[PDB]
Amino acid sequence: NLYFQSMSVGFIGAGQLAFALAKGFTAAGVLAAHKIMASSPDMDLATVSALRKMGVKLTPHNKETVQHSDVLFLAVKPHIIPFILDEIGADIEDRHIVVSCAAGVTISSIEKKLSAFRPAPRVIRCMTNTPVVVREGATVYATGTHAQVEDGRLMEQLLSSVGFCTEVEEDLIDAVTGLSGSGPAYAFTALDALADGGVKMGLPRRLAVRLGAQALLGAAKMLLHSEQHPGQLKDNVSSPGGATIHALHVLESGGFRSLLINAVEASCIRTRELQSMADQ
Amino acid sequence: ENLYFQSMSVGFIGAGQLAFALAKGFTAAGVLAAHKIMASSPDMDLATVSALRKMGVKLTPHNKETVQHSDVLFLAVKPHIIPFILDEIGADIEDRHIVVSCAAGVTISSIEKKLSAFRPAPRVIRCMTNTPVVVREGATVYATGTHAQVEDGRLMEQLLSSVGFCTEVEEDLIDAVTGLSGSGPAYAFTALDALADGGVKMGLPRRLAVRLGAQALLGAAKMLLHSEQHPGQLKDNVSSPGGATIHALHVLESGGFRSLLINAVEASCIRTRELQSMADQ
Amino acid sequence: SMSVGFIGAGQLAFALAKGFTAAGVLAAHKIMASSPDMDLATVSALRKMGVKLTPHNKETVQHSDVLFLAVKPHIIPFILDEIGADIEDRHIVVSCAAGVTISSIEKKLSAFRPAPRVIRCMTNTPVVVREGATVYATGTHAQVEDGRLMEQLLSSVGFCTEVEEDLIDAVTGLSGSGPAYAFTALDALADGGVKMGLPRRLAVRLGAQALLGAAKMLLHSEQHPGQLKDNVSSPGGATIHALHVLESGGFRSLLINAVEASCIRTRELQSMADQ
Amino acid sequence: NLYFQSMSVGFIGAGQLAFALAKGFTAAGVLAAHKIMASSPDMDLATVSALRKMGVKLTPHNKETVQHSDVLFLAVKPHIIPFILDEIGADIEDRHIVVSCAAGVTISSIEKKLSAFRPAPRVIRCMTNTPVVVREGATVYATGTHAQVEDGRLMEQLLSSVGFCTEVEEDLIDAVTGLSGSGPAYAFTALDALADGGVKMGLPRRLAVRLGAQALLGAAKMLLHSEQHPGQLKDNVSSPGGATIHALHVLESGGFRSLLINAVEASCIRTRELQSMADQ
Numbered sequence A, D: 001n002l003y004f005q006s007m008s009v010g011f012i013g014a015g016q017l018a019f020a021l022a023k024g025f026t027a028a029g030v031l032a033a034h035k036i037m038a039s040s041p042d043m044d045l046a047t048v049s050a051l052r053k054m055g056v057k058l059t060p061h062n063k064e065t066v067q068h069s070d071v072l073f074l075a076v077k078p079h080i081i082p083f084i085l086d087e088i089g090a091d092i093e094d095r096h097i098v099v100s101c102a103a104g105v106t107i108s109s110i111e112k113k114l115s116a117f118r119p120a121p122r123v124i125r126c127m128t129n130t131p132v133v134v135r136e137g138a139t140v141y142a143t144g145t146h147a148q149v150e151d152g153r154l155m156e157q158l159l160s161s162v163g164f165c166t167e168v169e170e171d172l173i174d175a176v177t178g179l180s181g182s183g184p185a186y187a188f189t190a191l192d193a194l195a196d197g198g199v200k201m202g203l204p205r206r207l208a209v210r211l212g213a214q215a216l217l218g219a220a221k222m223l224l225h226s227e228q229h230p231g232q233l234k235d236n237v238s239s240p241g242g243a244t245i246h247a248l249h250v251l252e253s254g255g256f257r258s259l260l261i262n263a264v265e266a267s268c269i270r271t272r273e274l275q276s277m278a279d280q
Numbered sequence B: 001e002n003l004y005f006q007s008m009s010v011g012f013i014g015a016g017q018l019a020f021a022l023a024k025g026f027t028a029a030g031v032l033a034a035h036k037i038m039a040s041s042p043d044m045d046l047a048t049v050s051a052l053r054k055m056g057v058k059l060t061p062h063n064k065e066t067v068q069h070s071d072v073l074f075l076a077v078k079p080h081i082i083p084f085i086l087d088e089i090g091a092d093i094e095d096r097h098i099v100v101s102c103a104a105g106v107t108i109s110s111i112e113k114k115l116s117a118f119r120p121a122p123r124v125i126r127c128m129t130n131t132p133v134v135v136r137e138g139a140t141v142y143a144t145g146t147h148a149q150v151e152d153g154r155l156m157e158q159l160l161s162s163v164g165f166c167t168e169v170e171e172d173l174i175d176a177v178t179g180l181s182g183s184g185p186a187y188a189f190t191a192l193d194a195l196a197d198g199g200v201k202m203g204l205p206r207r208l209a210v211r212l213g214a215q216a217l218l219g220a221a222k223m224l225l226h227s228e229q230h231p232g233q234l235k236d237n238v239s240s241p242g243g244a245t246i247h248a249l250h251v252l253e254s255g256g257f258r259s260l261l262i263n264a265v266e267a268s269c270i271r272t273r274e275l276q277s278m279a280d281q
Numbered sequence C: 001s002m003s004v005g006f007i008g009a010g011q012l013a014f015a016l017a018k019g020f021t022a023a024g025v026l027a028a029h030k031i032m033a034s035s036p037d038m039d040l041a042t043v044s045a046l047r048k049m050g051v052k053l054t055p056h057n058k059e060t061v062q063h064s065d066v067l068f069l070a071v072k073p074h075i076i077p078f079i080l081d082e083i084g085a086d087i088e089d090r091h092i093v094v095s096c097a098a099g100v101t102i103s104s105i106e107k108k109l110s111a112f113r114p115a116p117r118v119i120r121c122m123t124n125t126p127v128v129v130r131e132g133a134t135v136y137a138t139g140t141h142a143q144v145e146d147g148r149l150m151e152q153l154l155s156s157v158g159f160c161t162e163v164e165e166d167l168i169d170a171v172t173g174l175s176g177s178g179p180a181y182a183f184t185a186l187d188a189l190a191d192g193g194v195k196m197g198l199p200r201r202l203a204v205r206l207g208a209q210a211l212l213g214a215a216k217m218l219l220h221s222e223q224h225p226g227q228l229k230d231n232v233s234s235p236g237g238a239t240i241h242a243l244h245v246l247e248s249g250g251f252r253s254l255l256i257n258a259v260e261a262s263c264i265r266t267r268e269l270q271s272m273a274d275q
């Protein structure tokens, strides 16, 4: 029965991640929609039309978001961040907790820009994913130089309401991006392909999408609720000589495992290239 | 609640992974008391047989006892035992029984051929389910046989819906479902092991990497199930231009990721047909 | 107290006799072995070990209680004809020849005496250091003590368990051919150690020790091999980098391919036996 | 023998390797569990749970481990080493033998850090693996600038109680890491896949794991006990036209040998990359 009575949340950016989090927070009951405000330079986005139905306050002016908010999410593209922080930097107060979800934007770069206006800005770096929209996100966060102990606990409380959330060291966020940030896209790709396979073997497309999604959801839930190794759970499904062990062999023959390792690695490395442009 | 007060007796011929998964699921659902379940196995030293004991499921080495106890009888053995099994307990199948075959590839026609030699109208249902019934998130399909009453199919759907998704299909779809959701959880466990390796390669502790990858898959599956959206649209929606995610998608494409999962569904389906081509011939 | 014979005096005959005598279960002089080409190195090796040697297969039969068939499979028919009239009630015939079915042996021997006691066994060369992997299947007329006796004899030179005969082709692909896969892998690992600067001899020793220690860890753990893999792979470390390059090559699938190919070939040989 | 009467051993780090060595040492009889002390900054590790049950005295203060030890194993990740050498570098005494088991951490770098406190730190670099836990490890060590003759002898004796052990030049340690350090992980991968193959061909999983593990163990022991080349052993067991030579062909067709060469090389090269971060 969680609810933040004295918290006002702002989003700079009204893209997919801002909508997902606002929808998750409101569905979770931790935050009334009208105590949330978001700002975007494009008031004709599909997400902007959706936020208005929820009752989120919308404004085109970032300073308006900053002046309304206590917790301020930065959910914009990384190249705009230096211009955003210049724009609202003079408007950051002691009460503000700045939570950056911008891709590869480091705590150092945000604190350096904001400290030019006011010392000790309270900064938290967040890496979350879109399944927060169904309250099954995976979120990690790292606390900045000046964030109080209570700032991180508060952020963990809020982000726990929309999925898994834990604190990490900041130099793990690139790797988490490659795993759970990009993970949902890997799964959507897998689900489309599995459904194609279902259709090839004779299933209606709709049924094949449903079954494949249910299979993935159930397997993930099994693992989360098991203490056992994913290899052990795989062993339990694969009856000797059966259909499943035959299909696993053709996965192995294509290097299935290595493609997913490749993917995690490529997403993490790209995130570091973006962290470099942030720090350069 | 309705099924519970039916006070249904359930039997499993076969006490393996799937029998344990379903027994665990049904009891967790509250639809069945563990001691109203009976399971038989030719081998009592299995680990699944021991977990079944601890649950309080009744265990016996005698298939006839499982049959006589049961109202709904699950057949959960390898496809090549089924003719031996139906020969053994075919005389004991009563008009009141619903026979539910889970044995992969085994056709309704083959079961009814054996059982029709004893009672004339055996009630047979063919089922294809998976191991996540154990956490009540299974994916189940079933096809009703020649003599299954309309109420038999509804009862089956109600029972299997308590542990996951369940819907009726025509029987000629079941081998393809086997390739998709029957074998699906194993594809996912393989993917999760690999994603965790990738997380560990890039600096995460194994424990956290397992947790994050599993949470990622779960939330993405839930997202798809709750949206009317095409999975490619969801993929589009989350891949920002120039971003880390689209870079990772490219390397998946470059290895033919999609084709491997199609290959897998196809190989599992074809294998199931090969096992049915020894059930029939 | 028991007398053991070997029709055949090759790699598998020597490995078993060396294993048994090293184990203290059999005295070298209570073992006899027969061979045509009495000029194999393994023949001269059994000689130095104390095993009695004869060129006449019938003499081995007359000497033995338990009679191992360690010949190539194309020789089994020509052998069951030669000695089939010399099999007695007391004999346990243990076939180790590749893909030779219990059916084919009992059918040939039943033409001489009903109820021949036949056991089919699939073992491997590491019995020579008492770390073999053995499975056996009992025939139609094998008494209970026959299989119990077999398990006691073979357990002295490694792991041993009973299986249904229709699992033996798969076991061949796994533990029957497995030592060859490990020898190939050890040669390759040593090549990699030498490329990175190690002397060959140290590289062979280190690679073999690593494989021995890993195998023992798994046997002595209750844990899944993937779990042990997780335990050794430090985040960001050298091991997880090396596992990625194995995965990129389809390493796992090649070993699956191997077990499958060896099993399938064994089945092809069982076919020519069953005709 | 007398090397071990009244010897105390300490571990800084309670990860996988400190448990493996502690379990192996106590099972060997060379040390008593109570005479072993370990320091971990997080009692949440699963290994820290087991170490306590062994009777190994645990503590969070690394300085306590240093005070209580004669032979000091450093079993942490390589990037904490500069932090840990700064923490207890003043507590290193002439009596200490400092044994580094941190990946890629060079003797030069440890001696550089500790030479700023007392002038002649006794340092040994060690490369062991996890099968020390069943006393079948493969260990090599390199002796540093100030290690006495008895120091190498004592290390050899200690590590010989849990497996193979020999002295190498330090510049072979990266190559050994790639071979016997990563080796057990190659074997676990191979065993999982060999079991998958046995399962595909009809075997129960449990029997397939047992049989594959027994085959590998027996083959390795066979090679250790023969004077013969691994290729000659391969020849001896491959009968003409038989099942084994058919299986070897499909291994060759996938470049099986080259993958394992690739693996040793990749692990060695990564160790060199870590060695460079130790000297930067």
Ligand SMILES: O=C1CCc2cc(C(=O)O)c(F)cc2N1
Residues within 6 Å of the ligand: A237, A238, A239, A241, A242, A243, A244, A245, B018, B102, B103, B104, B127, B128, B129, B130, B178, B182, B183
């Ligand atoms: O309900 C069922 C039937 C038995 C079954 C067998 C396999 C197999 O691997 O052969 C499977 F993948 C899924 C199932 N699920």
Ligand SMILES: O=C1CCc2cc(C(=O)O)c(F)cc2N1
Residues within 6 Å of the ligand: C232, C233, C234, C237, C238, C239, C240, D017, D101, D102, D103, D104, D126, D127, D128, D129, D177, D181, D182, D183, D267
């Ligand atoms: O002694 C030691 C500690 C350093 C080390 C690191 C790895 C790794 O690659 O993660 C390894 F496999 C073995 C060792 N051996």
